Every structure is written in C-alpha cells, then in structure tokens.
Design an enzyme around this catalytic site. Structure first.
Site, PDB file in Angstrom:
ATOM      1  N   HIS A   1       0.831  -1.188   0.000  1.00 44.99           N
ATOM      2  CA  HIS A   1       0.000   0.000   0.000  1.00 44.99           C
ATOM      3  C   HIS A   1       0.868   1.240   0.000  1.00 44.99           C
ATOM      4  O   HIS A   1       1.946   1.246   0.604  1.00 44.99           O
ATOM      5  CB  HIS A   1      -0.903   0.072   1.245  1.00 44.99           C
ATOM      6  CG  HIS A   1      -1.873  -1.065   1.364  1.00 44.99           C
ATOM      7  ND1 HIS A   1      -2.373  -1.485   2.572  1.00 44.99           N
ATOM      8  CD2 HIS A   1      -2.453  -1.848   0.420  1.00 44.99           C
ATOM      9  CE1 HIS A   1      -3.220  -2.486   2.375  1.00 44.99           C
ATOM     10  NE2 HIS A   1      -3.291  -2.723   1.074  1.00 44.99           N
TER      11      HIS A   1
ATOM     12  N   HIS B   1      -3.168   1.183  -4.221  1.00 50.31           N
ATOM     13  CA  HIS B   1      -2.515  -0.131  -4.306  1.00 50.31           C
ATOM     14  C   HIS B   1      -2.925  -0.825  -5.618  1.00 50.31           C
ATOM     15  O   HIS B   1      -3.691  -0.262  -6.414  1.00 50.31           O
ATOM     16  CB  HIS B   1      -2.896  -0.997  -3.097  1.00 50.31           C
ATOM     17  CG  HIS B   1      -4.367  -1.256  -2.993  1.00 50.31           C
ATOM     18  ND1 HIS B   1      -5.192  -0.519  -2.172  1.00 50.31           N
ATOM     19  CD2 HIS B   1      -5.170  -2.139  -3.642  1.00 50.31           C
ATOM     20  CE1 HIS B   1      -6.439  -0.944  -2.312  1.00 50.31           C
ATOM     21  NE2 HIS B   1      -6.449  -1.917  -3.200  1.00 50.31           N
TER      22      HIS B   1
ATOM     23  N   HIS C   1      -3.746  -4.785  -7.678  1.00 49.76           N
ATOM     24  CA  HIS C   1      -3.998  -6.225  -7.644  1.00 49.76           C
ATOM     25  C   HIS C   1      -3.421  -6.789  -8.923  1.00 49.76           C
ATOM     26  O   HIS C   1      -3.428  -6.111  -9.946  1.00 49.76           O
ATOM     27  CB  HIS C   1      -5.495  -6.513  -7.609  1.00 49.76           C
ATOM     28  CG  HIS C   1      -6.166  -6.047  -6.362  1.00 49.76           C
ATOM     29  ND1 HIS C   1      -6.506  -6.901  -5.331  1.00 49.76           N
ATOM     30  CD2 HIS C   1      -6.527  -4.812  -5.962  1.00 49.76           C
ATOM     31  CE1 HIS C   1      -7.074  -6.211  -4.363  1.00 49.76           C
ATOM     32  NE2 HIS C   1      -7.108  -4.942  -4.721  1.00 49.76           N
TER      33      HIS C   1
ATOM     34  N   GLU D   1      -9.378  -7.181 -11.048  1.00 47.15           N
ATOM     35  CA  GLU D   1     -10.461  -7.639 -10.198  1.00 47.15           C
ATOM     36  C   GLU D   1     -11.754  -7.507 -10.954  1.00 47.15           C
ATOM     37  O   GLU D   1     -12.445  -8.499 -11.170  1.00 47.15           O
ATOM     38  CB  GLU D   1     -10.452  -6.909  -8.857  1.00 47.15           C
ATOM     39  CG  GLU D   1      -9.250  -7.363  -8.027  1.00 47.15           C
ATOM     40  CD  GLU D   1      -9.490  -7.290  -6.547  1.00 47.15           C
ATOM     41  OE1 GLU D   1      -9.707  -6.166  -6.069  1.00 47.15           O
ATOM     42  OE2 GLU D   1      -9.439  -8.340  -5.872  1.00 47.15           O
TER      43      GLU D   1
ATOM     44  N   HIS E   1      -6.216   0.639  -7.725  1.00 41.45           N
ATOM     45  CA  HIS E   1      -7.282   1.156  -6.833  1.00 41.45           C
ATOM     46  C   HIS E   1      -6.775   2.372  -6.109  1.00 41.45           C
ATOM     47  O   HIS E   1      -5.723   2.283  -5.479  1.00 41.45           O
ATOM     48  CB  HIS E   1      -7.657   0.128  -5.790  1.00 41.45           C
ATOM     49  CG  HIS E   1      -8.416  -1.038  -6.353  1.00 41.45           C
ATOM     50  ND1 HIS E   1      -8.526  -2.244  -5.694  1.00 41.45           N
ATOM     51  CD2 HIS E   1      -9.113  -1.173  -7.512  1.00 41.45           C
ATOM     52  CE1 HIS E   1      -9.248  -3.083  -6.437  1.00 41.45           C
ATOM     53  NE2 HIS E   1      -9.607  -2.463  -7.544  1.00 41.45           N
TER      54      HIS E   1
ATOM     55  N   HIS F   1     -11.484  -7.508  -0.424  1.00 35.87           N
ATOM     56  CA  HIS F   1     -10.910  -8.509   0.491  1.00 35.87           C
ATOM     57  C   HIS F   1     -11.408  -8.256   1.927  1.00 35.87           C
ATOM     58  O   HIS F   1     -11.962  -7.185   2.194  1.00 35.87           O
ATOM     59  CB  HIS F   1      -9.367  -8.594   0.381  1.00 35.87           C
ATOM     60  CG  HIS F   1      -8.647  -7.321   0.714  1.00 35.87           C
ATOM     61  ND1 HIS F   1      -8.638  -6.783   1.980  1.00 35.87           N
ATOM     62  CD2 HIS F   1      -7.887  -6.498  -0.049  1.00 35.87           C
ATOM     63  CE1 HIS F   1      -7.928  -5.666   1.980  1.00 35.87           C
ATOM     64  NE2 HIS F   1      -7.453  -5.474   0.762  1.00 35.87           N
TER      65      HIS F   1
HETATM   66  C1  LIG Z   1     -11.075   0.313   4.609  1.00 35.49           C
HETATM   67  O1  LIG Z   1     -10.036  -0.634   4.391  1.00 35.49           O
HETATM   68  C2  LIG Z   1      -9.758  -1.527   5.390  1.00 35.49           C
HETATM   69  C3  LIG Z   1     -10.237  -1.436   6.691  1.00 35.49           C
HETATM   70  C4  LIG Z   1      -9.797  -2.345   7.644  1.00 35.49           C
HETATM   71  C5  LIG Z   1      -8.896  -3.339   7.305  1.00 35.49           C
HETATM   72  C6  LIG Z   1      -8.436  -3.458   6.002  1.00 35.49           C
HETATM   73  C7  LIG Z   1      -8.865  -2.555   5.030  1.00 35.49           C
HETATM   74  N1  LIG Z   1      -8.467  -2.616   3.670  1.00 35.49           N
HETATM   75  C8  LIG Z   1      -7.205  -2.811   3.164  1.00 35.49           C
HETATM   76  O2  LIG Z   1      -6.262  -3.253   3.816  1.00 35.49           O
HETATM   77  N2  LIG Z   1      -7.107  -2.453   1.845  1.00 35.49           N
HETATM   78  C9  LIG Z   1      -8.058  -1.744   1.082  1.00 35.49           C
HETATM   79  C10 LIG Z   1      -8.695  -2.360   0.003  1.00 35.49           C
HETATM   80  C11 LIG Z   1      -9.537  -1.608  -0.804  1.00 35.49           C
HETATM   81  S1  LIG Z   1     -10.266  -2.338  -2.236  1.00 35.49           S
HETATM   82  N3  LIG Z   1      -9.299  -3.509  -2.795  1.00 35.49           N
HETATM   83  O3  LIG Z   1     -11.491  -2.973  -1.838  1.00 35.49           O
HETATM   84  O4  LIG Z   1     -10.323  -1.311  -3.225  1.00 35.49           O
HETATM   85  C12 LIG Z   1      -9.767  -0.262  -0.547  1.00 35.49           C
HETATM   86  C13 LIG Z   1      -9.154   0.337   0.539  1.00 35.49           C
HETATM   87  C14 LIG Z   1      -8.305  -0.393   1.363  1.00 35.49           C
HETATM   88  O5  LIG Z   1      -7.473   0.251   2.224  1.00 35.49           O
HETATM   89 ZN   LIG Z   2      -7.963  -3.069  -4.070  1.00 33.30          ZN
END
Ligand SMILES: COc1ccccc1NC(=O)Nc1cc(S(N)(=O)=O)ccc1O
Ligand SMILES: [Zn+2]
Length: 257
Positions: free
Chosen positions: A64, A91, A93, A103, A116, A197
């Site tokens: 990230h 980040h 994928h 994705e 993303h 995820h």
């Molecule tokens: C609110 O996020 C989170 C809250 C609590 C724990 C983990 C995450 N999430 C993460 O570690 N990655 C993450 C993933 C996406 S996604 N892949 O769906 O666009 C978008 C933003 C994110 O920060």
């Molecule tokens: Zn993502």
C-alpha cells in the site's frame, strides 16, 4: 487469518466473513449492454497534493501507498457524489499470469492488473475507521491495467519496492501525485459495492474507468517479486491477489458516457 492461497482464499473467506456472500460484493463483471447511462453523473474531479504521500508498506498479501489524511489537501469530487472524499491510499492487484490479474472484468474480459485509489467520506465522517463500514463511507477509483508497453508513471512506485521486499517492511514514500497514474479520459462506470478482500464491508462506491492504462510484462513481474514472508524466512512470492468477480444481485451499473 485470510489470504489468496488454497486454505485461506476467496472461496474460504465466507467462513470468517459471512458478508462475502452478500448483495453488494465487489468486484463484478461490467456488461456494457446491461449498463444504464445516467445523465445526472457529473465529471470526476480529483485534486491531490503531492506532499500528502506518506509511506509505502508491504502488507503480506499486497503493498500500500498511504497518504496523510488529516485534511482536505487531496480530494475526490463529482461523479455520483455530493460529498467530498479524502484520499488515503492506492494499491494494485495482479494475477499469477498476464492472462488475468484485474479484479473487475468488462464483458468477460480479464485484464492483467488493476489500480485502486481509495478515499473516505470526510464530509460525513471524522475518520477512516468510522467511514470504513458505512454504506457511503468509501470511494475507490478502479483502473484496468492492460499488458503492453512499460508505463513510465509506474516507475517511482516500482523503484520503492526494493526497500519493502518482505512482509511488514515499510518506508517513507513522499512527493507523489497518484492522479499521474490515472487514464487521460475519466469516463466511468459506477455501482455500489464492497472492499474486495476482508473485512469485505459494503461501503464502497466504485468508479471504474472506461480507459485502461499500460503495464509491461516485466513491470508485472516486479509486483510478483514482492515477498509475502517475513525477512529471514523461505522466500514466498506474492504471485496473485485478485478476487473473482461476484454476483450483481439486482444492482445496476451506471455509465457516465
Ligand atoms: C477500509 O479498508 C480496510 C479497513 C480495515 C482493514 C483493512 C482494510 N483494507 C485494506 O487493507 N485495503 C483496502 C482495500 C480496498 S479495495 N481492494 O477494496 O479497493 C480499498 C481500501 C483499502 O485500504
Ligand atoms: Zn484493491
């Protein structure tokens, strides 16, 4: 504990996180014949301050690039939003092979990777932790990455990965405006969805760009060269981190174009 391998993967996620079999799960297949053009959708307005770039971190399943999110220096506006959203992270994928890795899919077509750029609703909420689980808490720009020519704009990100090769490693990552990674046309699809995820919260308004960006087969290999293990252990490459597309369940994908 969750991941992208056999025991702890996307098909196992429902066992600890029942919302995986929910009604607003991401990613989805965007069928262009089934999208509904919406004339109320304003243009996407991004305005990011390079000085908000903070830190890069190897999170085991991915990496990230996090941003300082204490004020409105870096914001998303327009689209389907009345609220201004604050940038906190970007980040990627990717997949095991060039043949997949994105994705979202468009008419069944799998891309090689996906960018993303995530934001949280600071007009309504006081923090990311508060926003993270709210229906209108999160906005994520998704950009499909098509294998071809090397993308020079990926360079600084790629060059920083050598300092965070193993799980938990982190380093400063400053003076970077992630709107430089965005396609030149901001025409988009939007739909209500989820984090892709765990914890899989149904808090994301997705903005999927129509236009792709390039990535070389070698640039992809750098992503897959990141290790999931901690320093000193047997090297385990982060081969893939993409979730399969999920049932739309009556949701409609809107097009701004
Ligand atoms: C609110 O996020 C989170 C809250 C609590 C724990 C983990 C995450 N999430 C993460 O570690 N990655 C993450 C993933 C996406 S996604 N892949 O769906 O666009 C978008 C933003 C994110 O920060
Ligand atoms: Zn993502």
């Amino acid at each position: 504990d969750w991941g992208y391998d056999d025991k702890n993967g996307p098909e196992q996620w429902s066992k600890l996180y029942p919302i995986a079999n929910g009604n607003n799960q991401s990613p989805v297949d965007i069928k262009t014949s089934e999208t509904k053009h919406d004339t109320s959708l304003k243009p996407i307005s991004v305005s990011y301050n390079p000085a908000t770039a903070k830190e890069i971190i190897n999170v085991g399943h991915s990496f990230h690039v996090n941003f300082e999110d204490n004020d409105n220096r870096s914001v998303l506006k327009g689209g389907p939003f009345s609220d201004s959203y604050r940038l906190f992270q970007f980040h990627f994928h990717w997949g095991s092979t060039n043949e997949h890795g994105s994705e979202h899919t468009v008419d069944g077509v799998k891309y090689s990777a996906e960018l993303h750029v995530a934001h949280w609703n600071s007009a309504k909420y006081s923090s990311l932790a508060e926003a993270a689980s709210k229906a209108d808490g999160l906005a994520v720009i998704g950009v499909l990455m098509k294998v071809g020519e090397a993308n020079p704009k990926l360079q600084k990100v790629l060059d920083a990965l050598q300092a965070i090769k193993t799980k938990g490693k982190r380093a400063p990552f400053t003076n970077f405006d992630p709107s430089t990674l965005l396609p030149s046309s901001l025409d988009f699809w939007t739909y209500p969805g989820s984090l892709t995820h765990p914890p899989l919260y149904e808090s994301v308004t997705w903005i999927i760009c129509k236009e792709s960006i390039s990535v070389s087969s070698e640039q992809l290999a750098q992503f897959r060269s990141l290790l999931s293990n901690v320093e000193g252990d047997n090297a385990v490459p982060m081969q893939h981190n993409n979730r399969p597309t999920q049932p739309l369940k009556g949701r409609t994908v809107r097009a701004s174009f």
